[PDB]
Amino acid sequence: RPEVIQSHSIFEQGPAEMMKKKGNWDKTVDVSDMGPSHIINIKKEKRETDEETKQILRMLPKDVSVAELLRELSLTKEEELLFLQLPDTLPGQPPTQDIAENACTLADLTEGQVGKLLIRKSGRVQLLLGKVTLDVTMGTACSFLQELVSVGLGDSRTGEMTVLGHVKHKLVCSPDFESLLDHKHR
Amino acid sequence: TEGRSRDGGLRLGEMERDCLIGYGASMLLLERLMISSDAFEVDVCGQCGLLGYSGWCHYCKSSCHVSSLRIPYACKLLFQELQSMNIIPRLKLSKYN
Amino acid sequence: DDEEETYRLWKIRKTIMQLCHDRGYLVTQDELDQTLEEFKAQSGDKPSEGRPRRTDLTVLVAHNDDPTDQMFVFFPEEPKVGIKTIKVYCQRMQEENITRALIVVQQGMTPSAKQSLVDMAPKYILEQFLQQELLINITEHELVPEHVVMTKEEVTELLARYKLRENQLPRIQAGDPVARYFGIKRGQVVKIIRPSETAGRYITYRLVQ
Amino acid sequence: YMQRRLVKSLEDLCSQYDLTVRSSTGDIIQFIYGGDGLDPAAMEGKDEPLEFKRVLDNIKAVFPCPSEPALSKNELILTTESIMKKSEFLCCQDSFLQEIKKFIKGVSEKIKKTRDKYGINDNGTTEPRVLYQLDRITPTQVEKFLETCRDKYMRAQMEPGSAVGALCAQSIGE
Amino acid sequence: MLLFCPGCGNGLIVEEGQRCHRFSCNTCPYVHNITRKVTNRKYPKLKEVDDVLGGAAAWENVDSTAESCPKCEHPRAYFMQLQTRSADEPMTTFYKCCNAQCGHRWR
Amino acid sequence: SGKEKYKLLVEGDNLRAVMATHGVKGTRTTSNNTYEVEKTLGIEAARTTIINEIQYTMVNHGMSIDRRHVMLLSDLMTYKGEVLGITRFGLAKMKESVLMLASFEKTADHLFDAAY
Ligand SMILES: [Zn+2]
Ligand SMILES: [Zn+2]
Ligand SMILES: [Zn+2]
Secondary structure (H helix, E strand, O other), X not given: OOOOOOOOOOOOOHHHHHHHHHHHHOOOOOOOOOOOOOOOOOOOOEEOOHHHOOOOOOOOOOOOHHHHHHHHHHHOOOOOOEEEEOOOOOOOOOOOOOOOOOOOOHHHOOOOOOOEEEEOOOOOEEEEOOOXXXXXXXXXXXXXXXXXXXXXXXXXXXXXXXXXXXXXXXEXXXXXXXXXXXXXXX | OOOOOOOOOOOOOOOHHHHHHXXXXXXXXXXXXXXXXXXXEEEEEOOOOOEEEOOEXXXXXXXXXXXXXXXXXXXXXXXXXXXXXXXXXXXXXXXXX | OOOHHHHHHHHHHHHHXXXXXXXXXXXXXXXXXXXXXXXXHHOOOOOOOOHHHHOOEOOOEEOOOEEEEEEEEEOOOOOEEOHHHHHHHHHHHHHHOOOEEEEEEXXXXXXXXXXXXXXXXXXXXXXXXXXXXXXXXXXXOOOOOEEEEOOHXXXXXXXXXXXXXXXXXXXXXXXOHHHHHHOOOOOOEEEEEEEOOOOOEEEEEEEEO | OHHHHHHHHXXXXXXXXXXXEEOOOOOEEEOXXXXXXXXXXXXXXXXXXXXXHHHHHHHHHHXXXXXXXXXXXXXXXXXXXHHHOOOHHHOOOHHHHHHHHHHHHHHHHHHHHHHHHHOOOOXXXXXXXXXXXXXXXXXXXXXXXXXXXXXXXXXXXXXXXOOHHHHHHHHHHO | OOEEOOOOOOEOEEEEOOOOEEEEOOOOOOEEEOOOOOOOOOOOOOOOOHHHHOOOOOOXXXXXXXXXXXXXXXXXXXXXXXXXXXXXXXXXXEEEXXXXXXXXXXX | OOOOOOOOOOOOOOHHHHHHOOOOOHHXXXXXXXXXXXXXXXXXXXXXXXXXXXXXXXXXXXXXXXXHHHHHHHHHHOOEOOOOOOXXXXXXXXXXXXXXXXXXXXXXXXXXXXXX
């Protein structure tokens, strides 16, 4: 390898570097419009950030609860599936369910209207579930696929498995400890 | 012995020996670290290099090569601990003048 | 490049001129004060001038002892000099019937050729210098005092004044860079004149071992 | 721990009577102790055996001879060389004699500059005789100066037998 | 860049097939033919130029009809624009004036 | 005030390369690392480097040592042609002794090997 490399004072032209770089890789062998050479647009390889899957192409901020319900109501009239986490005990009694002040889940409630979701002015979203007001906040937003399926075992050995729709957003309901303590201090 | 409660006496450490080397006091260092600590006369045979007693080397069975020699007791203790370990120190004595 | 390479080929040559002036070899005075612009005359840039066979020296003879005692200076071309290249220089030397030679390598030498240079011959000695070492004269440094090789008749007077043997002097290794500079061997005594803080001078001596 | 290592390495060194510093086996460390052969414990100057200006002022103040004529430049150089070529000054090194002759040349130049600034004839006859007090040096003071310098240089040498490696170890570890 | 199989989610490797180079899984049949130019740019950090421009450097950005500096109102000043980090940064503008009895540094 | 010149502090451990670049005056450059100066400029420059470096370190703390002491320390390290330590390996090369080294470390291996 010749070691004594030679240099000159002249200044490199910008476009000359640009067009040399251009000519080094703009060459394309895409002429093979054939089956093997073809590629399926809906099964591209997964770039790692799951919101950012598209590395090759044919050519984000975080929402809040009032913005999510504003879009789901006014922007589109299409129904949508949410997934909300409730606190461990709901402020109710199990009706004639053979008791001890245990947990009161949704499995111990009956059907019907069970509460009123009050969106206040300026972002505050409360879930009035009686006299007490639960608070609703946007949970950790999932980006991977969440399918909401049904499993019905109508026969002893066989049954029906049915998908109801894709779950996009997650809510979290949490009590208002500031209000619960400001009712009666301790 | 060691401490005050045993009426023990002080310690010429490893640093005061260096300071006495620095003055060049040879006989003071000899007197401190031999004569006022543990003085002991051995008799060393000049032919076999082993220690003896009373002008008599038991090893060679002779009296015609032994020498009187002032030595610290810690050194004699070292030499007999080494001869018990079968590491033999053979003291080759030269001469004066 | 091609100004820095001719700068190196000037500086290595000037260093070898002062090294041959120090060892007792007949150096013409014009080669010691050779400016770069005068070096441009008989030697040029990369395509015209060539290192390995055009910048050599065999003119150097020890004018003190005998003009048949002579010494080569070669500038080998490949960075890692091969054993066959050493045999080429050795057969050139054998045909020319001289005993001393230098080798100015560029990046080093393979360890096989270095093991060769020890066991080629006691009569055929060659000295590996890296060219990165020769780009400054280590004798003209401010930390290296003036060394002087002594004659046997002065080493005998030294050993008779202090009433010594040879093996009681301080040592200096044979692989020492200034020992490689002066070309001294095992058994010789060098004088060192250490510069003082006052205007005096102190003298010491070192045996090569 | 550093001082213990320096002691165990240096303690065998000693200054022999032929003024070499040899190790335990007898290899030479230095041919002369520190180049000059002088003790660091007897340095009156900044790492130098004397400070000539202070010694000369000492001799001008301790031995004033009011009955002696003040020397000129040439008379000073002449009587200085007349003292320094005697027998006992062969024991000193060449460097110490060079430093003495250098200092005496400096003093003689000061005498010449003063007697040129004041117009003082060297015959000894100018009328304001206080002018001979300016850079006054007499031959008695020159004799005592040179004897005091030779005595301090002879007592300032490294005495043989001195455990000089232990002094190096302690003077670095302290 | 790491790219992962939609089927099994192992890491893909690049290999060459009979018509194209392919991204291929090692553990399932999935392969992806590289039909067009695909790239991944690192954009590393360059050297600091703060002490490189001080002291009468070989600047060249001056041009005819250039603006005078605002303090002295003379064109006796150089100005330059450089990326300080990688070339995705928008270039910053800076200028220094050097005149007789006048030394200043500006932005 | 009489001059203004630029020296170049280099934090590196290859003195041979720094001395051989174009534009650096090789006849006036030094180091701290004594072994590099031993490898490059010889044993005697290593002796002078050890002298100047110990006296530099002593002067920066306001203590004063007469130069004969560090001179003897530098001559004790380099009287066998190679810069030796004051650690136990260099002390083993300077001192031949067995009991001196047995006082230092290495429980019984020196004594049994010296018996061997
Ligand atoms: Zn016996
Ligand atoms: Zn896969
Ligand atoms: Zn300006």
